[PDB]
Amino acid sequence: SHMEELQNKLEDVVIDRNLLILGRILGEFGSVMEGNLKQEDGTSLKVAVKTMKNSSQREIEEFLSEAACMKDFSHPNVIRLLGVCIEMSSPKPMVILPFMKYGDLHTYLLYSRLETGPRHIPLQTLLRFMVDIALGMEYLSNRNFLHRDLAARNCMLRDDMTVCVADFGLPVKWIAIESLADRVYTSKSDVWAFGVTMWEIATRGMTPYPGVQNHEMYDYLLHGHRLKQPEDCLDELYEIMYSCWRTDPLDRPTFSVLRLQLERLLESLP
Ligand SMILES: CN(Cc1ccc2nccn2c1)c1nnc(-c2ccc(-c3ccccc3Cl)cc2)o1
């Protein structure tokens, strides 16, 4: 029955192409399109459709396998995979996601500094964003799933302004020191990317390490330098993000420890 569990997950993740109607292109690695998904209750749902790219057997079965694992995730701060579709060329898979009208968190932070879009984001909400990602990441690491592409651009905003982790890997300034050197990736490397993500949130969308080029990053970190404390950022919050960048990956806290520290800090605000 150990294999029968994979077959169960496999049947579940596939969506009939006829239940899907494709809309306009939102982004042009593969495309992001809007779509309509006909549900079991007879009504249509607005969805986001991600199309992907070379073998028509092994790599496709690999996509279905990976998608079957992804649809098994069930947490309010992890994007939910609604299912997958396949379309053949003259070998193009599609992944079906809930439509997020508020978009990615990175764009939202940037828009908040311009007169038109969202208004100034206060400290409590910036901390609520960090708690939400920590909760989603905590769910993932406890299931032994590595994100491998954690950044503000890969976190999505739901209609109730809840953040969910998304766009799972497969970005040099999000990569842990040991991942740049030993080409090794663990949950401590996700914790490092999370600290960088927290810094993007606190700076309201600044690119990490201003004045340091991508090809200078490994030598920069090797000499002990880390991301600087953002202006008006709490010392406690900075200590939490800094703890994510400890040279020894074993010294870095887990997501569960980080989530707790962030919740206490949030509750402590007036
Ligand atoms: C496109 N995107 C972001 C998004 C979401 C929602 C949204 N609404 C409007 C615009 N939007 C944009 C997104 N978030 N998560 C994913 C994703 C993509 C691929 C896979 C995957 C990769 C390999 C094998 C199997 C799978 Cl299922 C998993 C998750 O993509």
Short mmCIF file of all heavy atoms in Angstrom, two decimals, residues 156-187, unseen atoms left out:
data_model
loop_
_atom_site.label_atom_id
_atom_site.label_comp_id
_atom_site.label_asym_id
_atom_site.label_seq_id
_atom_site.Cartn_x
_atom_site.Cartn_y
_atom_site.Cartn_z
N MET A 156 2.35 34.98 -2.02
CA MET A 156 1.16 35.54 -2.64
C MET A 156 0.23 36.11 -1.59
O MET A 156 0.25 35.66 -0.45
CB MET A 156 0.44 34.50 -3.52
CG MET A 156 1.29 34.03 -4.73
SD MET A 156 1.77 35.32 -5.95
CE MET A 156 0.10 35.84 -6.63
N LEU A 157 -0.53 37.15 -1.96
CA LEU A 157 -1.54 37.73 -1.07
C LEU A 157 -2.93 37.26 -1.44
O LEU A 157 -3.41 37.53 -2.56
CB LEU A 157 -1.52 39.26 -1.06
CG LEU A 157 -0.43 39.85 -0.22
CD1 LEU A 157 -0.01 41.20 -0.76
CD2 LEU A 157 -0.83 39.87 1.27
N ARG A 158 -3.60 36.63 -0.47
CA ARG A 158 -5.00 36.18 -0.60
C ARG A 158 -5.91 37.41 -0.41
O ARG A 158 -5.44 38.45 0.07
CB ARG A 158 -5.30 35.08 0.44
CG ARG A 158 -4.54 33.77 0.24
CD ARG A 158 -4.70 32.87 1.46
NE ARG A 158 -3.82 31.70 1.43
CZ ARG A 158 -4.18 30.52 0.94
NH1 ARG A 158 -5.41 30.34 0.47
NH2 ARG A 158 -3.33 29.50 0.94
N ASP A 159 -7.22 37.30 -0.79
CA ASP A 159 -8.20 38.40 -0.71
C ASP A 159 -8.40 38.97 0.71
O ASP A 159 -8.76 40.14 0.84
CB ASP A 159 -9.57 38.01 -1.33
CG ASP A 159 -9.53 37.52 -2.78
OD1 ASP A 159 -8.62 37.95 -3.53
OD2 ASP A 159 -10.40 36.70 -3.15
N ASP A 160 -8.16 38.15 1.77
CA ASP A 160 -8.26 38.58 3.16
C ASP A 160 -6.92 39.13 3.70
O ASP A 160 -6.78 39.30 4.92
CB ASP A 160 -8.77 37.42 4.04
CG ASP A 160 -7.80 36.25 4.17
OD1 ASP A 160 -6.93 36.08 3.28
OD2 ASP A 160 -7.92 35.50 5.16
N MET A 161 -5.94 39.34 2.79
CA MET A 161 -4.59 39.88 3.01
C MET A 161 -3.62 38.91 3.75
O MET A 161 -2.56 39.33 4.23
CB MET A 161 -4.64 41.27 3.69
CG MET A 161 -5.00 42.41 2.72
SD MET A 161 -3.99 42.47 1.20
CE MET A 161 -2.40 42.84 1.89
N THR A 162 -3.99 37.61 3.80
CA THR A 162 -3.20 36.51 4.39
C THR A 162 -2.11 36.20 3.34
O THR A 162 -2.40 36.21 2.13
CB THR A 162 -4.11 35.26 4.68
OG1 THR A 162 -4.88 35.46 5.87
CG2 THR A 162 -3.34 33.93 4.81
N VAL A 163 -0.87 35.98 3.80
CA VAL A 163 0.23 35.62 2.91
C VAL A 163 0.33 34.09 2.82
O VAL A 163 0.23 33.39 3.83
CB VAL A 163 1.60 36.25 3.31
CG1 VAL A 163 2.66 35.96 2.26
CG2 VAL A 163 1.46 37.75 3.53
N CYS A 164 0.58 33.58 1.62
CA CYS A 164 0.85 32.16 1.46
C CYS A 164 2.13 31.99 0.65
O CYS A 164 2.40 32.78 -0.26
CB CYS A 164 -0.34 31.41 0.85
SG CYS A 164 -0.58 31.69 -0.93
N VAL A 165 2.96 31.02 1.02
CA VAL A 165 4.19 30.69 0.28
C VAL A 165 3.79 29.94 -1.03
O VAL A 165 2.84 29.17 -1.05
CB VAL A 165 5.31 30.00 1.10
CG1 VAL A 165 5.69 30.84 2.32
CG2 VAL A 165 4.91 28.59 1.53
N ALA A 166 4.48 30.24 -2.11
CA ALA A 166 4.11 29.75 -3.43
C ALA A 166 5.33 29.62 -4.32
O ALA A 166 6.45 29.75 -3.84
CB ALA A 166 3.12 30.75 -4.05
N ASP A 167 5.10 29.34 -5.63
CA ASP A 167 6.10 29.29 -6.69
C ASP A 167 7.37 28.61 -6.24
O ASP A 167 8.47 29.19 -6.31
CB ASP A 167 6.39 30.73 -7.16
CG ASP A 167 6.15 30.99 -8.63
OD1 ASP A 167 6.44 30.09 -9.45
OD2 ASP A 167 5.70 32.11 -8.96
N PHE A 168 7.20 27.37 -5.74
CA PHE A 168 8.23 26.50 -5.19
C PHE A 168 9.31 26.28 -6.24
O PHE A 168 8.97 26.11 -7.42
CB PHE A 168 7.61 25.17 -4.70
CG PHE A 168 6.31 25.33 -3.96
CD1 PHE A 168 5.10 25.00 -4.57
CD2 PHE A 168 6.28 25.89 -2.69
CE1 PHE A 168 3.88 25.21 -3.91
CE2 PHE A 168 5.06 26.09 -2.02
CZ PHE A 168 3.87 25.74 -2.63
N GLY A 169 10.57 26.35 -5.80
CA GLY A 169 11.75 26.20 -6.64
C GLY A 169 11.68 25.08 -7.66
O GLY A 169 11.32 23.95 -7.31
N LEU A 170 12.02 25.40 -8.92
CA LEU A 170 11.98 24.53 -10.11
C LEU A 170 10.57 24.02 -10.43
O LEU A 170 9.68 24.81 -10.74
CB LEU A 170 13.00 23.37 -10.03
N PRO A 171 18.99 33.42 -8.15
CA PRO A 171 18.53 34.32 -7.08
C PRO A 171 19.57 34.36 -5.95
O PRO A 171 19.24 34.28 -4.77
CB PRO A 171 17.19 33.69 -6.65
CG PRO A 171 17.21 32.26 -7.20
CD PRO A 171 18.50 32.04 -7.94
N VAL A 172 20.84 34.49 -6.37
CA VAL A 172 22.10 34.52 -5.61
C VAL A 172 21.97 35.20 -4.20
O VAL A 172 22.43 34.61 -3.22
CB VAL A 172 23.22 35.14 -6.52
CG1 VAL A 172 24.17 36.08 -5.78
CG2 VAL A 172 24.00 34.04 -7.24
N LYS A 173 21.30 36.37 -4.11
CA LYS A 173 21.12 37.19 -2.90
C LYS A 173 20.12 36.62 -1.87
O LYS A 173 19.92 37.22 -0.81
CB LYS A 173 20.76 38.64 -3.28
CG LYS A 173 21.96 39.36 -3.90
CD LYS A 173 21.65 40.76 -4.37
CE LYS A 173 22.92 41.55 -4.52
NZ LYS A 173 22.63 43.01 -4.61
N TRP A 174 19.57 35.44 -2.13
CA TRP A 174 18.68 34.73 -1.21
C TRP A 174 19.30 33.40 -0.78
O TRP A 174 18.78 32.72 0.12
CB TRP A 174 17.30 34.51 -1.85
CG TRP A 174 16.44 35.74 -1.86
CD1 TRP A 174 15.46 36.07 -0.96
CD2 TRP A 174 16.47 36.79 -2.84
NE1 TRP A 174 14.90 37.28 -1.31
CE2 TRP A 174 15.51 37.75 -2.45
CE3 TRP A 174 17.26 37.05 -3.98
CZ2 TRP A 174 15.28 38.93 -3.20
CZ3 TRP A 174 17.03 38.21 -4.70
CH2 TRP A 174 16.06 39.14 -4.31
N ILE A 175 20.42 33.03 -1.43
CA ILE A 175 21.12 31.75 -1.23
C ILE A 175 22.09 31.77 -0.03
O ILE A 175 22.98 32.60 0.04
CB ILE A 175 21.80 31.32 -2.58
CG1 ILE A 175 20.70 31.14 -3.70
CG2 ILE A 175 22.63 30.03 -2.41
CD1 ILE A 175 21.19 30.83 -5.15
N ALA A 176 21.92 30.81 0.89
CA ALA A 176 22.78 30.65 2.08
C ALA A 176 24.25 30.42 1.71
O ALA A 176 24.55 29.85 0.66
CB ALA A 176 22.28 29.50 2.94
N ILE A 177 25.17 30.89 2.56
CA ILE A 177 26.62 30.82 2.36
C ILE A 177 27.12 29.38 1.99
O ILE A 177 27.93 29.23 1.06
CB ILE A 177 27.37 31.44 3.59
CG1 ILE A 177 28.90 31.55 3.34
CG2 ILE A 177 27.05 30.70 4.93
CD1 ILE A 177 29.65 32.46 4.31
N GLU A 178 26.61 28.34 2.68
CA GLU A 178 27.00 26.94 2.45
C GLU A 178 26.40 26.38 1.15
O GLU A 178 26.96 25.44 0.57
CB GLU A 178 26.70 26.04 3.68
CG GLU A 178 25.22 25.69 3.88
CD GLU A 178 24.28 26.75 4.43
OE1 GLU A 178 24.72 27.88 4.72
OE2 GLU A 178 23.08 26.42 4.59
N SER A 179 25.27 26.95 0.68
CA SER A 179 24.61 26.56 -0.56
C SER A 179 25.35 27.14 -1.77
O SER A 179 25.30 26.56 -2.85
CB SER A 179 23.15 26.99 -0.56
OG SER A 179 22.45 26.39 0.51
N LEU A 180 26.05 28.28 -1.57
CA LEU A 180 26.87 28.92 -2.61
C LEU A 180 28.21 28.19 -2.76
O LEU A 180 28.75 28.14 -3.86
CB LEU A 180 27.16 30.40 -2.24
CG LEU A 180 26.02 31.40 -2.26
CD1 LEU A 180 26.34 32.59 -1.39
CD2 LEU A 180 25.71 31.87 -3.68
N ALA A 181 28.75 27.66 -1.63
CA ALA A 181 30.04 26.98 -1.54
C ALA A 181 30.00 25.49 -1.78
O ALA A 181 30.73 24.99 -2.64
CB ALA A 181 30.69 27.26 -0.19
N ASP A 182 29.22 24.75 -0.96
CA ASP A 182 29.15 23.29 -1.01
C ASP A 182 28.05 22.77 -1.94
O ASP A 182 27.97 21.55 -2.14
CB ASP A 182 29.01 22.72 0.42
N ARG A 183 27.22 23.67 -2.53
CA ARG A 183 26.10 23.35 -3.42
C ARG A 183 25.09 22.37 -2.76
O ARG A 183 24.47 21.54 -3.43
CB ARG A 183 26.58 22.86 -4.81
N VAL A 184 24.94 22.50 -1.42
CA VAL A 184 24.08 21.73 -0.54
C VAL A 184 22.90 22.58 -0.06
O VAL A 184 23.09 23.74 0.31
CB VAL A 184 24.90 21.21 0.67
N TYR A 185 21.70 22.00 -0.04
CA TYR A 185 20.50 22.72 0.40
C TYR A 185 19.69 21.94 1.43
O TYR A 185 19.36 20.77 1.20
CB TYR A 185 19.64 23.10 -0.81
CG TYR A 185 18.90 24.41 -0.62
CD1 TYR A 185 19.42 25.60 -1.11
CD2 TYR A 185 17.66 24.44 0.01
CE1 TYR A 185 18.73 26.80 -0.96
CE2 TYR A 185 16.96 25.64 0.16
CZ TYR A 185 17.50 26.82 -0.33
OH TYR A 185 16.83 28.00 -0.16
N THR A 186 19.40 22.58 2.58
CA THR A 186 18.60 22.00 3.67
C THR A 186 17.51 22.97 4.10
O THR A 186 17.29 23.99 3.43
CB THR A 186 19.49 21.59 4.88
OG1 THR A 186 20.05 22.75 5.48
CG2 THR A 186 20.56 20.58 4.53
N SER A 187 16.81 22.65 5.20
CA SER A 187 15.77 23.52 5.75
C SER A 187 16.40 24.78 6.36
O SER A 187 15.72 25.79 6.49
CB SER A 187 14.92 22.77 6.77
OG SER A 187 13.68 22.38 6.19
#
